[PDB]
């Protein structure tokens, strides 16, 4: 259902405290969505993110809303689908934040 999907991304988390502590390596690996292996940012030939780079698109998310990187899955009817050709999920481009 699209109505619930759209309604469930504007909600505000409720809390009453802020806790600070030390970060375990397992905690850091739990935060991450992938490992950065190469120091290149932008291709400069297609002006697209380079794989396993600082500005990568499989680790950090799509560059366009509900649009995969290679271009197989491109619309909102495919939301949540992880492409099998490049591993990019199709969601909002704000998840890069």
């Amino acid at each position: 259902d699209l109505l619930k999907f759209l309604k469930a991304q504007t909600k505000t988390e409720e809390f009453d405290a802020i806790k600070i502590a030390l970060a375990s390596p397992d905690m850091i690996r739990s935060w991450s969505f992938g490992e950065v292996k190469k120091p290149e940012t932008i291709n400069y030939r297609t002006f697209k993110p380079e794989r396993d780079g600082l500005f990568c698109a499989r680790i950090f998310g799509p560059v366009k809303d509900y649009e995969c990187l290679c271009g197989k899955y491109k619309r909102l009817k495919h939301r949540g689908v992880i492409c099998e050709k490049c591993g990019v999920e199709v969601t909002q481009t704000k998840v890069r934040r």
């Binding site: 699209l2 109505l3 290149e40 909102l76």
Partner: protein, 405 residues
């Protein structure tokens, strides 16, 4: 033949690589060899078309389901303002069983009258009809243009003006004013809110003019260069035996080899570019249509190399002339015969054909025969089929599809 060892084949393979790929490949060899080294704001949110459409969707008294449908409809709108998916894909993206296509059409007809008008239109006919409906009823030629937009648009597409007069029962006076009114419409309504920047290419070779003669040199910004790490080279002389010295020796050897192979690529590129720009000084002085028909065997006769080397070097490397940026393979072209025993390049015949077509009588366009005969008075000797091939390479419609009133 030549005894090909897999260390010479890597030096040969280094030629057919662009500067970006060459710098990408140099990093891998840099991080696998200790003795190698290299010598060396927040932003602003712009408003696109979809953001503008959403700003109006949120301010329109929709319902909870209508707004969800409008989100899908606005999402499937490209930068030209045309709906890129059928409504059956939007009804599927909603993911609800009770919603029918009638509601989707009702929401689409409301989204289609946003700013700009005609946005999110299925095709050109719908996009023109939407704009034609917003005009005041007391408008000249409104019904006459609407009739041919709604019924006979293929005839106007093929410039079949004769058939339009018969089917629409119209004279010359109205069939020109109505068509002018149609051309007054906006074909792409979504390009009003257009945001973006073009993409640039940093050249490899720079050619300029100095003291009346052309000078050529490699672009010093993008040229790749490596260096030997002296601190590790100072450890060669028996810091410790066996590995401690053998490793440094066997890596210094390969670093020297790689640096030599990079210099042997830069020099070859520079010499090939200098020969190329020396053989076609006519092109840079007075633009196109004066370019000579040269091939690989012509270049691999003054620099004294093999044709396969010239083939590899000129791959994906750009040259910056005062005219513009070129591929450095754009200068190798075919040829056709000429009066006087000479030859004329295809890249000049294309410019001549473009110039002749861009100056014909609009009422009576020139056909391929009328271009072949016109060219065969300067002694160009081109067959009609070759002229047709050149025109279709230039993406120019045939003569019967260029006439107009």
């Amino acid at each position: 033949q030549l005894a090909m060892t897999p260390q010479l084949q890597q030096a040969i393979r280094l030629l057919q690589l662009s500067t970006l790929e060459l710098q990408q490949e140099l990093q891998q060899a840099l991080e696998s060899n200790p003795l190698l080294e290299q010598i060396d704001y927040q932003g602003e949110t712009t408003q696109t078309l979809q953001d503008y459409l959403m700003w109006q969707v949120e301010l329109t008294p929709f319902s909870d389901t209508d707004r969800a449908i409008a989100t899908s409809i606005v999402d499937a709108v490209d930068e030209t303002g045309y709906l890129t998916v059928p409504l059956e894909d939007i009804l599927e993206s909603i993911g609800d069983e009770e919603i029918d296509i009638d509601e989707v059409e009702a929401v689409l007809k409301r989204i289609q009258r946003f700013d700009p008008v005609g946005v999110a239109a299925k095709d050109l006919r719908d996009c023109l009809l939407i704009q034609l409906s917003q005009f005041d009823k007391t408008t000249p030629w409104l019904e006459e243009a609407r009739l041919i937009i709604s019924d006979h648009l293929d005839l106007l597409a093929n410039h079949d003006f004769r058939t339009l007069m018969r089917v629409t029962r119209l004279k010359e006076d109205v069939l020109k004013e109505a068509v002018n009114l149609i051309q007054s419409l906006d074909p792409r309504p979504g390009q009003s809110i257009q945001t973006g920047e073009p993409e640039y290419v940093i050249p490899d070779v720079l050619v300029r003019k100095h003291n009346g003669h052309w000078t050529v040199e490699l672009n010093s910004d993008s040229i790749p260069r490596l260096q030997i790490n002296q601190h590790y080279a100072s450890m060669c002389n028996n810091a410790r035996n066996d590995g401690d010295s053998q490793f440094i020796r066997s890596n210094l050897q390969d670093a020297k080899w790689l640096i030599k192979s990079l210099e042997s690529r830069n020099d070859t590129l520079l010499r090939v570019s200098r020969c190329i720009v020396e053989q076609q000084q006519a092109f840079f002085e007075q633009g196109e249509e004066y370019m000579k028909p040269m091939v690989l065997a012509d270049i691999a006769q003054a620099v004294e190399m093999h044709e396969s080397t010239i083939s590899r070097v000129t791959t994906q490397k750009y040259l910056h002339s005062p005219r513009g940026i070129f591929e450095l393979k754009y200068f190798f072209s075919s040829h056709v015969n000429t009066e006087g025993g000479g030859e004329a390049s295809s890249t000049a015949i294309r410019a001549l054909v473009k110039k002749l077509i861009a100056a014909e009588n609009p009422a009576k366009p020139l056909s391929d025969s009328k271009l072949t005969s016109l060219l065969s008075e300067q002694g160009i000797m081109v067959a009609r089929r070759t002229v047709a091939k050149y025109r279709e390479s230039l993406s120019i419609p045939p003569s019967n599809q260029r006439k107009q009133l």
